[PDB]
From a paper:
Thioredoxins (TRX) are small globular proteins of about 100–110 residues, which are conserved in all living organisms. They participate in multiple critical redox-reactions via the reversible oxidation of the active site CXXC catalytic motif1. Two TRX forms were described in Escherichia coli, Trx1 and Trx22. The former, called EcTRX throughout this work, is a widely used experimental model for investigating the molecular basis of protein stability, folding and function.
Despite being monomeric in solution, non-crystallographic symmetry is observed for the E101G and N106A mutants (two molecules per ASU) and for the L107A variant (seven molecules per ASU). Very weak electron density was observed for one of the L107A monomers, which was mostly modeled based on non-crystallographic symmetry restraints. No structural perturbations are found near the mutation site for the E101G and L107A mutants, which illustrate the robustness of the CTH element to sequence changes. The local effect involving loops centered in residues 20 and 83, as already mentioned, is observed for the L107A mutant and, in a lesser extension, for the E101G variant. Regarding cavities of the L107A mutant, the outcome of this substitution is a slight increase in the solvent-exposed surface, as Leu107 is a partially exposed residue. Notably, the four variants crystallized in different crystal systems, comprising monoclinic, triclinic, orthorhombic and trigonal space groups, for L94A, E101G, N106A and L107A respectively. As expected from solution experiments, the global structures of the four variants are mainly unchanged compared to wild-type EcTRX, with main-chain root-mean-square deviation of atomic position (RMSD) differences of 0.59, 0.48, 0.62 and 0.48 Å for L94A, E101G, N106A and L107A, respectively. We found that global stability of the variants is progressively altered from 8.1 (wild-type), 7.8 (N106A), 7.4 (L94A), 7.2 (E101G) to 5.8 kcal mol−1 (L107A).
Numbering used by the authors: 1 to 107
The structure:
Amino acid sequence: SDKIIHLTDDSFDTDVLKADGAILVDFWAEWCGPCKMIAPILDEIADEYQGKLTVAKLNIDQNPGTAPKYGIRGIPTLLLFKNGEVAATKVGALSKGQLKEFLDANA
Ligand SMILES: [Cu+2]
């Protein structure tokens, strides 16, 4: 879990919107079962895609401001950013194989 960026409402603009590379943002909360199910999957993606993709997490309980800006209505929601713009989104939990397909669909 060492390579995942810990986002806040204040750092979101700098860490995501002003970044150039691709960033996969996980909107999550501790009370969300499916969010905890995909947490180890995100760790593997962060390791596997090192140097090509940054994985980041935004806790919506601690950071209530960001999710509404992207019309997020439920968690977990994965937002894939490229050049500060949403390239794709995925609502709900998914397997590692499905998340790899999701990323390759955007490559
Ligand atoms: Cu936090």
